[PDB]
Structure 1
């Protein structure tokens, strides 16, 4: 890995760059540094990464780049709270992040439900997410893709459960209740990492934090990333109008000029609470929150027209 990369990949606000064919290397480097060189047989891990790459789609935002970007955010959390995590979590969380939007079409669970898509009948709740985990399992069962083959049966069931819960937690609908419970557990001191269900919840929050990490980048990356977010959402809003459903203003390209107030509302309602609470629980994740605020400042500055 190049000098600049080695240094800057430790920073929370690292951008993985425009060279797609370095991203596998970057991910492998992150597994090595946060899990270990002997965590995975290198050959199987490359075949697995490439097969995952292949089942991500050429969509504006929810693509291979976002999959690797999210995994990096996870990496930086792992490295800055490294004593906290089991060897199983050191193995399965980065993988969970890399697989967490497998085969995303660029469409919400709402759209899938309104369209009456087969996945909506097959998975009634967190529809895309149950699908991302189903894709993950089936890639794992391809000959030579069981990167967990040396684990015991028990250890294999456990890490898949980590991957499952982690991926499900990326459904933004579950985030609100989850963060409420965690807030109230931290204020009252009941929160405890020796309690599996509390540990699950924190991982869930770590995953929301990683999924939304584009708001913790420096302003130029965050602004440019917003073009990609909205390109998807506007395409979905287009498809809503074709069904004959007025889409919400978030996904309606005719409301472009209201994007700045749109972002502001979201940093206040969702992103700031998310990272604020995560910073309470894992203080060394503060740089994420700090960046989020700087970007919240930049949207107000945009709204003022300066």
Structure 2
């Protein structure tokens, strides 16, 4: 009850920054996450014993794939923590509780393949969920783990608060389907520009939380250049494995996933930063001004990919 998690001084200071890297020591990631829940939400949000037991069941249900792993889960939750801390008063007690949990859970039991590969392989999950296949699976795995004995971290919530937080988590996780991001940002762009955007409109909040989820999920592009560059290697290791599997089904993969087009990675990153990342962090900065450091970091990393193409590294 009187038990504060603290971190060594360098982590205690740097964890507050958007560009924080959670480091290579796997055994400190749970402590880091708990530290963030305590400062974001309070020491009273969750029964510590249940939270720790929930964190370790979430960890056990992420796989040893190169990118969509437990490190990704905690990284995406840290980005959300920074957004929530820099926008203290804009979010409800339930949203603060629900979103950190949503981020930790958003890629639960990922196998390192896109919704497309599941559909072209005819994986059973593609018959159970026709769109946002993995993302409906991820939410499903979240509910399963919440229903394990000693794991219901929301037990102190009311019947209606409980349903509200599970619905925040569902929409948050669904929104990490990048196919849904483009439309969601286009609507937010217009609503902000015409001045119709209203954070008392629940459907407006939904869209804004959805954009925060895309921002957090993509935050590898907002890190110091060496973190950004080395995460890109992990991202392509999954994509190229998927490309190999596409070829095994007798299908030319998209260039993104073809390890034979390694040479084109720098140009593919430019496309990605211009089509996806920059517009994402731009719109987010408009709606939530204190998130500007994510936009600024993203533009710096774009400029580093430009330098790679020009042979200056």
TM-score range, shorter chain: over 0.9
Distance 2:25 2:225 in 1: 21
Give the whole-Å Cα distance in 2 for the aligned partners of 1:157 and 1:265.
40
CA–CA distance in structure 2, aligned partners of residues 151 and 262 of structure 1? 45
1:192 matched to 2:198: yes
Query: Which residue is 1:104 aligned to?
Result: 110
* Cα drift, residue 223 of structure 1: 0.2
Q: Distance in 2 between matches of 1:214 and 1:192?
A: 30
Tell me, yes or no, if structure 1 residue 15 matches structure 2 residue 27.
no
Task: Report the Cα offset of residue 82 of structure 1.
Answer: 1.1
Task: Please give the TM-score of this superposition, normalised by the length of structure 1.
Answer: 1.00
Which portions of structure 1, spanning 4 or more consecutive aligned residues, are displaced by more than 6 angstroms?
A: none
SS at match of 1:13: coil
Match of 1:6 among 2, 9, 12: 12
- 1:247-286 Cα distance to aligned partner (Å, 9 max, x none): 0000000000000000001100010000000000000000
What displacement does 1:88 show?
0.4
Q: Deviation digits for residues 218-240 of structure 1, max 9, x if unmatched?
A: 10100000000000000000000
Displacement of 1:42 in angstroms is 0.4
Q: TM-score, normalised by structure 2?
A: 0.97
Alpha-carbon distance in 1 for matches of 2:161, 2:202: 16
Please give the secondary structure, in 2, of the residue aligned with 1:132. helix
Which residue, out of 253, 269, 273, partners 1:263? 269
Q: Deviations over 1:79-137 (max 9, x none)?
A: 00010110000100000000000000000000000000000000000000000000000
Structure 2 residue aligned with 1:128: 134
Cα distance in 1 for partners of 2:252, 2:148 equals 42
Trace 1:44-123 onto structure 2 (pairs within 5 A): 44-123=50-129
Hey, what's the Cα distance between the residues in 1 that align with 2:45 and 2:143?
A: 19
Q: Which residue of 2 aligns with 1:248?
A: 254
Distance, in Å, in 2 between the alignment partners of 1:93 and 1:295 is 27
- For the residues of structure 1 that align with 2:109 and 2:11, how far apart are their CA atoms? 28
Q: What CA distance in whole angstroms lies between the structure 1 residues aligned with 2:127 and 2:14?
A: 44
Instruction: Give how far 1:290 is off.
Output: 0.1
* Deviation at residue 48 of structure 1 after TM alignment: 0.1
Q: Provide the secondary structure at the position in 1 that maps to 2:64.
A: coil
Q: Helix, strand or coil: the match of 2:156?
A: coil
Write the distance in 2 (CA, Å) between the matches of 1:287 and 1:213: 11
Q: What is the CA–CA distance in structure 2 between the aligned matches of 1:266 and 1:7, rounded to whole Å?
A: 31
How far 1:30 moved relative to its partner? Answer: 0.1
Give per-residue Cα distances to partners, 1:162-210, cap 9 Å, x unaligned: 0000000000000000000000000010001100000000000000000
CA–CA separation in structure 1 for the residues paired with 2:179 and 2:120: 17
